Structure formats: structure tokens, C-alpha cells
Amino acid sequence: EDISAMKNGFIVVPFKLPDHKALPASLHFMFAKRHQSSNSNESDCLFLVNLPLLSNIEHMKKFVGQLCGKYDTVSHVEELLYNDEFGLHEVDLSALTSDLMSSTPRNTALLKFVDAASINNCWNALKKYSNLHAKHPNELFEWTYTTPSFTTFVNFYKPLDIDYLKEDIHTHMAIFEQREAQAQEDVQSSIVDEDGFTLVVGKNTKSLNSIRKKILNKIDKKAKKDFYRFQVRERKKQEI
Amino acid sequence: LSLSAGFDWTASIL
């Protein structure tokens, strides 16, 4: 309870659990640290650990909301990156099999903010929020665990809308055919290097990426033991 | 009553 920050630097951010009849002041804790990265998409992010079940951005929009109201700080969360609660998107099978259409830890995610003024405002609020558990646990915020995304996830057995699928299929093939057409023209366009070397492309070849991968993937019989004078002299040597 | 077996996590029962 007295613990506020982890020695490695991850601030503890408590949360109050619901009142459910099956579960008759149990809490849930985050561990958070400011995230630094030269990457633009990962810039202005807050590293979070031990996220609850199905924690979407709308959850983050709430809790920054009460923190903003309580501490009168202006903070906006732009998105929640690398949220894979079930590790489902860990490997991009589309990227591995081909490059067209896809040019590309656990129990943690990156919380992006709109600007640096928002994230440092949130971090100051988070440090104060951590101090509450030692002094006043009662005023601790309460996590909902009910969201429109949660209801859709809960409703596992839902027949898919055929009309939505029809449009999604149609757009995807239209894009893929355009990319496939462009790739096939590129290989069979008499590619010549800067110095006048003409690349070779076999017929039916469709992608230059394929040609590269083939390269990555990938005299003794005509030698005569008895032809030269030295060859019979050595044979005579071993003969006797 | 029931059949209850002590849970083994080292494959010791084998």
C-alpha cells in the first residue's frame, strides 16, 4: 500500500475492481513508465504493463478523463499501440508470404498522446494518483470493464453481415489485382542497370521480390584418371 | 466420494 513507484521506475497505478455478486476492496494495478523512442509513431508514448482484459483506447480515453477532471490537467490519448492481449497479431503472415499489400512484449502496450504537453501532464497526474493508495484508498478510481467493444467480443456467435463482407472482399481483390498487375509489368519491362546490364526475367514470373528470394534460396566427371604420361607413371608406381 | 489425484507438475507419476 505504501508502495508508489517501482525501483526500476515503473509507477504503480492502482484501480478499483467492480462490485459483482460472485466476488463479494480488491484492486488491480498497472505499471507505467514514460516511453522514449526516435520513431515518430512511438514518440510521445507511455509504456504500460499488466493491462486488464480487453483494454481498448476507449478505456484509456475514460481514465485520462477522470484524471484530467480530478487534477485539472489537459491530456488527450491519441491511440493505444501494440495492444495484443491475446498475442494474435504478433506475426504478420501476410508480410512473410509476399510483399504486396503488406510492406512490413506480452501483456503490455504503448499509450500515445496528442502532444508532449498532454503526456507530461498525464505523468504528473499519474504520480499524484499513485500517492493516493498510501493515504486515501477510498477515492481510488474504478475500472468499468464494460465497453461497446467488450459487448461485441462477448458475443462470439454472431453471423457476419453478408453485405459488409461483399464490399470488403470486392475492395481487397481490386487492390490486389492492381498491385499484381504493376508487379508483373515491372519485372517484364526490360530492366537495365545504370551501366547497361539487362536483367533476365523468366516467362510467367510475376514479382521481382520472388526473383530475389530464388537467389537467396539457391568438371570432375570429365577429368580423366588415365590420360597423361604422369598419370600412367603414377599408376605404374602403385601397380608395383 | 470421487477419484482425486494429486496434481503433478514434474511428470513424477510417470
Binding site: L23, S94, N155, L160 | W9
Partner: protein, 1077 residues
């Protein structure tokens, strides 16, 4: 062959007796011979005088029934010094160390002067021998006291080979002459001299009990009693001529004992009659001939393996009971005669003794079966069979050996009812000396005749029969018997024939203008149940008709009616163990479900007929690519669904049945995975479209599949068939397989093990799944009882929350092993015998060092050859080399479909894998400690649920049992297909997702089928969890902790159990009811 030969040697040395105990006992009985030499002689005495002489003595003579009365006992009694000699396996020095213990046989030969020529009549020789034994016991007892050995010697009578007519004195040592540590038993055999009685008068056809009917049992008893030393001499000559005789002898006694076969009498009911000396004398008979041309079948130069093989082949194929018998000369080449005596016969012309007299007809067939099935294993070259042949005891449990067991409680059991005693009569006392011998024969004939072809083999056992009785008493005393009948109750055990065990009508003789003798015995036996019927073929035959039931087989009704009508109208016949197992199988909600037999697959045939209707539709439909084929790959298509298919019962987890659709090979398939699978949905989307237009009576909807990891574009078409069945369709294409191989090659070295796992699940559903149905569906037919046992086996896994981690196919492969590989047992022919066999195998399966490999073939091609066999064995060693402890892989299940052996047994957590063996072990131990009974079965099918760290109870809003098609109900599909989810159980999906998030910390499991194991209304399901050792204790805090925890110190955290309970509760919503931690 060299592997076997060394395996023979290891067995001999392991069981070889320790020679020190030979000297210890040789020290004793050598001195016992001196005690005998002290015993004085006796004068001629009448029964009146010997009765007075024995009136006050503690000793009482073991008179054999009928005891000699003063009128018929006019012949006198006398004792004289016998000629002491040593007989038996110890004489041949073929003896062994037996943990249960062995026996030493010593013969005391009466002087011939104590016998008249016509003393083999009316038990005359029997009674004088009886007093002869008693006189020895009296003097031996006092002399035992004088030498001070009585402190540690206990004396009692016993029947020789459970022969009521040959009581003998049995000497043991209780805890210098103390031979208790030797664990040997000196038996004094009181036998007659050689050729006292004309053996021709003692032939089986002849009679010796005046009342004429022959007396084969008594004629053998006295004649065999007079022929002991001759067989002794006869066996030594052979022991010298062939060097491997003793080795061949010790190999068989293993094979006799493991099958529970002994030299004891079989007419009483106990299985036996073929012992070592039957085994050895068959050798010596064969070593001097045995063929129809009197040519030698066994040669003296043969080794132990060849000597054993010859007799097993000899007994397996030549018949010695009905058609054909063998004759030999102990004192002349043995010749096989074609004529048979209708009883097991090995005539000895030199001694005029049939050595198989004690061998019953019914037991002989089981002997002939056991030798034949071993001969097939003996000829086997692919697999080593030494352990099964010699180092596996099948005699432990009667249920595992015998398909059905029925205990018959006879009336008035301190003597049998007057009617039952009256049935014994005087003529049958001559034929069968004891009522136990006759009554056992009575049960076999009526039971054999009543069942007929429905059964293969029948055994009648007199449970609670004793063979040893104190010195103070004349005959064995049973608590129920009251000196009248030496048994508690009769147990009727069968080997059923699955092909015709469930036949509704028992066919009989054809009708004729004059009622034939076979028709005479036909109509009388079944009485009112007998009658005359006609059929479609136009044949007019006498037949009786029974009624099928889902709780008991037809065999239950036949034996109960047959025994009661003929044996005794008061008999009580009960087999509840069958009935409980039958009830545990879910009862489908179809018409006449209760009357349907457990072997009826009528529900399954109805399913594919509806599929065939859809099969015709899909083909005639025009598509951009022609249909290559539509392949059903479902559980109900392979006859393994736990609950039988029911129309409109869409709450069943197995309602939507997977089917593989493949089109003509085309070069236009997308080269990218997502475009390919989306292109597949477009093809399915057409199949939905003009199916809806042309066939509006069919309803359809689309669903997503996530079984294959990282392939999220899979969309399956669910068709709701008008007959009321659901089918799931997924499209298969050649490019799909190679694209997965492309992903593995392109994946980073660290990610390649993950991608190959994705490929493993893909082939498990698409490629290997097709093959699995094709073999099992064809293999299921001749294995009629495989479908019920695998369904009941699946039920047992679900009760214990194990199906969530075990794939459906693995449960089938483990469950088929007793069928494809029945050795050393037979193929299961009943639901309990098969199911207990599956549990027995899992209990004794050492999956870390022993692989499971099955020949999915029909009973005796596609059989595993030597090259294929060694290849799979090479695979197991390689995987175990990398994974010795078996943490990554536990069960290695392989076959022709799966040569890798990891296809259907990958991803199972090590904890769960140990549960299957741990639960199986305790179940076997429970059966040993307490016999198979109603209480034990109820335990076998109820879950403890206490060992789990935390237990979560759930209830669905509505009962799902009715909608699951289970009879303790929907008749049409809902108008809005959204309403299907409202009447379904999501807990299986709830647990699946929660494991993956908590894969590194927790293992949650639940009951897949809630309608079967969810109580009366089928709504109660339970989520049970386990905390791993690492996260159970406190850990230092790190980013890679990958667990929900609570800080305790500035660098220490502990598992967050309470929030996980809340996390489960919100995820469960209203279904969750209670939490037990």
C-alpha cells in the same frame, strides 16, 4: 531371433529358484521320510472298528461322498508301509521361484497286498485309501510332536488338483528345519501301485460305479492315481534326449500362469485342466511323432524357442476335442487320429489313461484361442511380443478378460432346494461325482444352447470354492454350503460375438411336415417363447423374438429366461455393471431411443443421407471453378460423436459438422495468404447465393474460424439443412499448403518454431483430417463396440475437464488401441470391457520411453512393415533426445496417417497429460481394492474438483439438455439466425481465450459438453484453474513477467488472484455464480 533368445535367457535367470532353499527343503523331507519309516503297521479292520479307533482321535478320515455305510462297507481296511517316492516338477528339477509359492509332491505307494483285483468298483479302492491317509496323519502328528517340529508345522487336508475324490495331506512351515523362507509345500500323494486294476476296465467308455452310464471322471482318478511313477520315468528319458526340455517347460508354465491356467479340475468351474505336466507330456508325445503320418513334429535338437513354438502351433490348429484326437505310448510313435471323442482327449495306449479328462469342452476352446493368438504374435516380426506373451498377467481381472459377467444366486443358499437337489438324481451322481460338477455342466449347456452363435466362449465359475479343510473334518465346509455345496454363488462369464450379439430373433430349425428332433429340442427349450414365423424370403422357421434396449444387451434377457426356466425358477440373475455403463452413454432424443441398441448407428446414417441430399445440390451448381470433390470430415461421419446427432438440436457442440470442399486446380489462385482465403470466401459466398435462390428450404449463414493461428481471414459457411442438421464448409486448395511452407522459410529463425506449429494445426484440420475419417470409418464396422467405447471414453474425459486440452482425434487413437492391438487380451466385445481396457492401457503406458504406434487395419495390405516400423521408432528416439523429460511432447501417437507422431498430441500441457495417466492409475487401483460394483462406477465418473487451486461455478440462463437432443426441445430453427447464440453454451470459448492470456501463469479448463455433464437441466458448468509453481510464489519485477501481479517490495511482486477472479467474473457476466479458492 537373437533378441528373443537373449530375452528368453533373462526371464529364466530372473525367475530361477535360489538353490539354497533346495538344500533347506531337501534337508527337511529327507528327514520326513525317516519319520514315515517310524510309523507302525496295522491289522485288518472293518469300518465299525476304524470308526471306533478314530472316534476319539482329533483326526477324522476324509471319506469321499457317498461315505461308506455299514451295509456296503463289508470289505475290511488295513495299513502297511508304503514305498515313499518323490514326484513332480521338483523330481524333474524344472521347478522355479514363485512369489505365491510352489509345492513338492511326495507319493506313498500302498503295498499291492492291500488291494483286491475288483477294488476299483463302487469307490472300493477310494475308501481304503481314505483311511490309509488318515492312519498316516494320526501317527505323523504324534511323531511330529515327539521330534518337536510341531511348533512350526501346520497340517491340513486338501484335494489334489481340486479333485474331490483325492484328498491329500498338505504340510507347510509357519514363521533348523524351518522352511517357511523357502515357500515350498510338501504334498503327500497317496497313490496306487502300477497295474493293480486292469486298465481296460478303466477306459473312459467303461463304467465302475454300479447303478450303464460311463464314469470317465472316476475311471481317470483311480487310474491316474495308479499311474504316477510311470509318467515320471517317461519324462526323464525325454529330458535326456533333448537338452532344452526344462527350458521349454519353464516357458509354458509362464504362459499358462499369465492366462490363469492350471492343472486343477475344470468341471467344478475354475478355468484350468491344462497344467505343466499336460504341457510337458504334450512335448514328449510330440517329440516322438504327433502327425497324421506319425512323423516327428518336434526334434530333440530343437532349442527352447522351437520346442515352445511347436506345441503352440500344434495346439492352435489341430483339434483334440470334437474332430480328432492324439494317441501316444509312454512305455509306438504318436499319431493324430481324425476321429474325436467330443471331449478333449490325449489317449495313452501304454497306460490307457486320457490325460485331458479334467480338461472341459468350454475351457478347451479358450485354450485353443489363446494358443492361436499367441502363434500370430509369435510369427510377428514387425513388433517385439516377448513382454505380452510372458510378462503380462491377464488373469488379474475377470471383466478385462471376459466381456460379460453374470452372478447367479441359487435358492436356499442350509442346503439347496429339494427340487434342485432332486434334479441331481442318482444317474448323474454316477456321471458327475459332485453336484458342483453337474450343476456347472447344467449351466453351460443351457447357457451355450440358449445363446448359441451370440457368444464365442462361455465359462462358469463357482465363486468361493475351497479345496483345503482342517484335520478334524472329513469334507470341505462352506459358510453358505453347510457341508452340502462348496461354493457361495455361480458367476456366468462370456466372450460375446459382436456380429450377432444383438440379433433381435434367434433363428432355428426350418418347418417340416413332420416335427424333427432338432425342432423338438427347439420348441421344448424356449417353451412359450418358442414359436413359428415367416419372413420376406419365404422361409418358414421356428424362431423366438426378443426386444432391444439401450440399457442392457439382448444377452441379458436370454440368460435370465433360459436359466430360470431350466435351472431354477427362483434363480436371481443380475449384471448391474453393464447397465450403469450403458446409462452413462447419453440417450438421444429420437423416436424409440430407449428401445434402440447401443450398437445401432441409425442416427448416424440419417445424418449422411441429409448430406447426400446436399451433396447432389452442390455438384450440379455452376461455379467459376468446377468442384473437385466434397469430403465430409466430421465426428458423426466417423461414428465418434459423444451424443448421437439429433434433428434441430443445435445446442450440441458437434452440431455443425465440418466438410472440406475442393475445386479444380487453377493457376489463378491468389499468391498471397489473405487474398487466397478471401478468394475462398468469395467462392463460398456464391455457394450461399444461388443455393438460397434455387433451394430456399435450405438456410445459411457465415462464421469466422480462428483455429489456425495468425490466419484470421478464414470464413466458413454454415448450412442449416431442412432435415434439421448443420454442416460447416471450408474450401481447400493446393496453393494453400505451399504458402504455409513459404511462410516458414521466410520467417526469422526465432519465429520458425512458431510458424511450423501453425502449419501443424493446418494439416491437422485439412490434410490429415480427411485421412483420419477414411480409415476410422471403414475400421469402425468390424469393431462394432469401438463407437460406444470411444463415446463413453470421451464422456469420461469431459467429466474430468480434460477434453478442452485433448483434441478429439487423440481420444480416438488412444481408444482404438485395445481393438487394433488387443494382445495379450482379445478384441473388446462389450462396452465395459473395452472402456476398462482403455483405462488399463493408459495406467500402464510409459509415454516418456514407450511410443504408441497403431496399425489402423482390419482384423486378420496397409500393415506397418519392418522398414516403416523402424523409421517411426527412429523418430521417437530423436524427439526424446531433444525432449527427454517430455515437457514439450508427452503422448507420441503415430500411424500411417501420422508418421511424425506429433500431429494430434502437440500443445497439450504437461500437467494435463499427467492427469490422464494419474487418473487412470487410481481408477485401476480403485478396481483392485474394491471390485467392480455400482459404487465404484459412480466414483469413476464423478470429478473430485478439490485439487484445483480455484474453482468457478457457472450456470447458463436456460437448460441446454433438451436442445442438445438428450432425453432426460426445438423442432425448427429460429426465424432469425441471431437467436441461435441465445441457446448455446459459450464456456468452452470462454476458457479457450482465458488460457492464452494466462498461458504463462494459469491453466483453466471446463466441461465442453454442458448438456451431458451439467446436471438434470444441463446448465451447470465449472471453470477450474491452476497456478504454475513459478508465479505461485513471489518473483522479482521485470517487464517480461507477463502476468497480473501485486507489488510487495520495491522489486517484488505476487500473483493477483483476486482480480483474475473479477476478470473471469466480468468475462463470464451473469453465467458465473460462485468462486471457490
Amino acid at each position: 531371433s537373437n533378441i528373443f533368445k537373449l530375452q528368453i535367457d533373462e526371464l529364466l535367470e530372473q525367475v530361477k529358484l535360489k538353490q539354497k532353499h533346495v538344500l533347506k527343503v531337501e534337508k527337511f523331507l529327507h528327514k520326513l521320510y525317516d519319520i514315515l519309516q517310524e510309523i507302525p503297521d496295522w491289522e485288518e479292520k472293518s469300518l465299525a472298528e476304524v470308526d471306533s479307533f478314530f472316534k476319539n482321535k482329533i483326526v477324522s478320515v476324509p471319506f469321499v461322498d457317498p461315505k461308506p455305510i455299514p451295509q456296503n462297507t463289508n470289505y475290511k481296511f488295513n495299513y502297511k508301509k508304503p514305498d515313499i517316492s518323490l514326484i513332480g516338477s521338483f523330481a524333474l528339477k524344472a521347478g522355479i521361484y514363485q512369489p505365491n509359492g510352489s509345492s513338492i509332491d511326495t507319493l506313498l505307494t500302498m503295498p499291492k497286498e492291500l488291494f483286491e483285483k475288483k477294488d476299483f468298483l463302487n469307490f472300493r479302492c477310494l475308501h481304503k485309501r481314505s483311511v490309509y491317509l488318515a492312519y498316516l496323519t494320526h501317527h505323523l502328528l504324534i511323531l511330529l510332536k515327539k521330534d518337536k517340529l510341531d511348533s512350526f508345522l501346520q497340517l491340513e487336508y486338501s484335494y489334489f488338483d481340486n479333485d474331490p475324490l483325492l484328498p491329500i495331506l498338505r504340510i507347510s512351515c509357519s514363521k533348523d528345519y524351518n522352511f517357511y523362507k523357502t515357500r515350498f509345500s510338501i504334498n503327500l500323494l497317496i497313490g496306487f501301485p502300477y497295474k493293480v486294476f486292469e486298465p481296460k476296465k478303466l477306459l473312459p467308455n467303461r463304467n465302475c460305479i454300479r447303478i450303464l452310464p460311463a464314469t470317465p471322471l472316476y475311471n481317470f482318478s483311480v487310474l491316474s492315481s495308479s499311474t504316477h511313477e510311470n509318467y515320471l520315468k517317461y519324462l526323464y528319458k525325454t529330458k535326456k534326449q533333448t537338452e532344452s526340455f526344462v527350458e521349454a517347460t519353464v516357458l509354458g508354465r509362464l504362459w499358462l500362469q499369465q492366462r490363469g491356467f492350471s492343472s486343477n479340475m475344470s468341471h467344478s468351474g475354475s478355468l484350468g485342466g491344462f497344467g505343466t505336466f499336460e504341457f510337458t507330456i504334450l512335448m514328449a508325445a510330440l517329440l516322438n511323432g504327433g502327425g497324421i503320418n506319425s512323423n516327428k513334429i518336434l526334434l530333440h535338437g530343437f532349442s527352447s524357442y522351437q520346442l515352445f513354438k511347436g506345441v503352440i502351433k500344434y495346439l492352435a490348429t489341430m483339434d483334440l476335442c470334437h474332430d480328432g484326437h492324439l494317441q501316444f505310448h509312454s512305455n509306438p510313435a504318436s499319431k493324430y487320429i481324425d476321429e474325436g471323442f467330443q471331449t478333449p482327449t490325449l489317449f495313452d495306449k501304454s497306460t490307457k489313461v486320457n490325460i485331458l479328462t479334467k480338461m472341459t469342452v468350454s475351457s478347451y476352446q479358450i485354450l485353443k484361442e489363446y494358443a492361436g493368438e499367441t502363434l500370430r504374435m509369435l510369427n510377428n516380426v514387425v513388433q517385439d511380443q516377448f513382454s505380452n506373451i510372458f510378462l503380462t498377467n491377464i488373469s488379474r481381472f475377470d471383466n478385462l478378460k471376459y466381456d460379460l459377467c453374470y452372478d447367479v444366486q441359487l435358492p436356499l443358499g442350509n442346503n439347496l432346494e429339494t427340487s434342485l437337489a432332486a434334479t441331481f438324481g442318482s444317474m448323474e451322481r454316477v456321471k458327475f461325482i459332485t453336484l458342483e460338477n453337474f450343476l456347472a455342466h447344467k449351466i453351460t449347456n443351457v447357457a451355450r444352447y440358449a445363446l448359441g452363435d451370440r457368444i464365442k466362449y462361455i465359462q462358469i465359475e463357482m465363486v468361493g470354492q475351497k479345496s483345503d479343510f482342517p484335520i478334524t473334518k472329513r469334507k470341505v465346509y462352506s459358510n453358505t454350503g453347510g457341508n452340502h455345496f462348496n461354493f457361495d454363488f455361480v458367476r456366468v462369464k462370456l466372450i460375446v460375438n459382436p456380429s450377432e450379439c444383438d440379433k433381435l430373433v434367434t433363428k432355428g430349425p426350418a418347418h417340416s411336415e413332420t416335427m424333427s428332433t432338432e425342432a423338438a429340442v427347439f420348441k421344448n427349450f424356449w417353451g412359450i417363447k418358442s414359436s413359428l414365423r415367416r419372413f420376406k424370403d419365404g422361409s418358414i422357421t421356428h424362431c423366438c423374438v426378443w426386444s432391444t434396449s439401450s440399457s442392457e444387451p439382448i444377452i441379458s434377457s436370454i440368460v435370465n429366461f433360459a436359466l430360470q426356466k431350466h435351472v431354477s425358477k427362483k434363480a436371481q440373475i443380475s449384471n448391474e455393471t453393464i447397465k450403469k455403463f450403458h446409462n452413462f452413454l447419453p440417450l438421444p432424443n429420437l423416436p424409440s431411443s430407449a428401445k434402440t441398441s447401443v450398437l445401432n448407428l441409425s442416427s448416424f446414417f440419417n445424418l449422411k443421407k441429409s448430406f447426400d441430399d446436399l451433396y447432389k445440390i452442390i455438384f450440379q451448381m455452376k461455379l467459376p471453378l468446377s468442384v473437385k470433390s466434397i469430403l465430409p470430415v466430421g465426428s458423426a461421419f466417423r461414428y465418434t460423436s459423444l451424443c448421437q446427432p439429433v434433428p434441430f438440436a443445435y445446442s450440441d457442440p458437434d452440431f455443425f459438422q465440418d466438410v472440406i470442399l475442393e475445386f479444380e486446380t487453377s493457376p489463378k489462385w491468389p499468391d498471397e495468404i489473405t487474398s487466397l482465403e478471401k478468394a475462398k470466401t468469395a467462392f463460398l459466398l456464391k455457394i450461399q447465393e444461388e443455393l438460397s435462390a434455387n433451394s430456399s428450404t435450405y438456410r445459411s449463414f457465415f462464421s469466422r474460424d480462428e483455429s489456425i493461428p495468425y490466419n484470421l481471414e478464414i470464413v466458413t459457411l454454415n448450412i442449416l439443412t431442412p432435415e434439421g442438421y448443420g454442416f460447416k464448409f471450408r474450401v481447400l486448395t493446393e496453393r494453400d499448403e505451399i504458402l504455409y511452407l513459404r511462410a516458414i522459410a521466410n520467417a526469422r529463425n526465432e519465429l520458425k518454431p512458431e510458424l511450423e506449429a501453425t502449419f501443424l494445426k493446418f494439416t491437422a484440420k485439412y490434410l490429415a483430417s480427411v485421412r483420419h475419417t477414411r480409415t476410422l470409418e471403414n475400421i469402425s464396422h468390424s469393431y462394432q463396440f469401438y463407437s460406444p467405447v470411444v463415446r463413453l471414453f470421451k464422456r469420461w474425459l469431459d467429466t474430468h475437464l480434460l477434453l478442452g486440452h485433448i483434441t478429439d482425434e487423440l481420444a480416438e487413437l488412444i481408444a482404438i488401441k485395445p481393438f487394433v492391438d488387443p494382445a495379450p487380451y482379445f478384441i473388446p466385445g462389450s462396452l465395459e470391457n473395452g472402456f476398462l481396457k482403455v483405462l488399463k492401457f493408459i495406467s500402464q503406458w510409459n509415454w516418456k520411453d514407450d511410443p504408441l504406434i497403431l496399425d489402423l487395419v482390419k482384423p486378420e495390405s496397409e500393415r506397418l512393415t519392418l522398414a516403416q516400423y523402424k523409421g517411426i521408432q527412429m523418430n521417437f528416439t530423436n524427439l526424446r533426445n531433444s525432449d527427454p523429460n517430455g515437457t514439450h511432447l508427452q503422448f507420441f501417437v503415430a500411424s500411417k496417417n501420422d508418421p511424425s507422431g506429433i500431429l494430434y498430441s502437440s500443445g497439450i500441457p504437461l500437467p494435463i497429460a499427467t492427469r490422464l495417466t494419474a487418473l487412470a492409475k487410481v481408477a485401476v487401483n480403485l478396481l483392485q481394492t474394491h471390485g467392480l460394483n455400482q459404487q465404484t462406477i459412480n466414483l469413476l465418473f464423478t470429478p473430485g474438483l478439490k485439487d484445483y487451486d480455484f474453482v468457478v461455478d457457472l450456470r447458463t440462463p436456460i437448460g441446454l439438455k433438451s436442445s442438445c437432443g438428450i432425453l432426460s426441445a426445438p423442432s425448427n430453427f429460429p426465424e432469425n439466425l441471431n437467436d441461435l447464440s441465445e441457446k448455446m453454451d459459450p464456456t468452452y470459448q470462454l476458457v479457450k481465450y482465458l488460457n492464452l492470456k494466462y498461458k504463462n501463469s494459469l491453466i483453466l479448463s471446463s466441461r465442453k459438453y454442458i448438456g451431458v455433464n451439467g446436471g438434470e437441466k444441463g446448465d451447470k458448468n465449472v471453470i477450474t484453474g491452476l497456478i504454475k509453481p513459478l508465479f505461485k510464489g513471489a518473483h522479482k519485477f521485470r517487464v517480461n513477467l507477463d502476468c497480473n501481479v501485486k507489488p510487495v517490495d520495491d522489486e517484488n511482486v505476487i500473483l493477483n488472484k483476486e482480480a483474475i477472479f473479477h476478470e473471469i467474473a466480468a468475462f463470464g457476466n451473469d453465467m458465473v455464480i460462485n468462486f471457490e479458492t
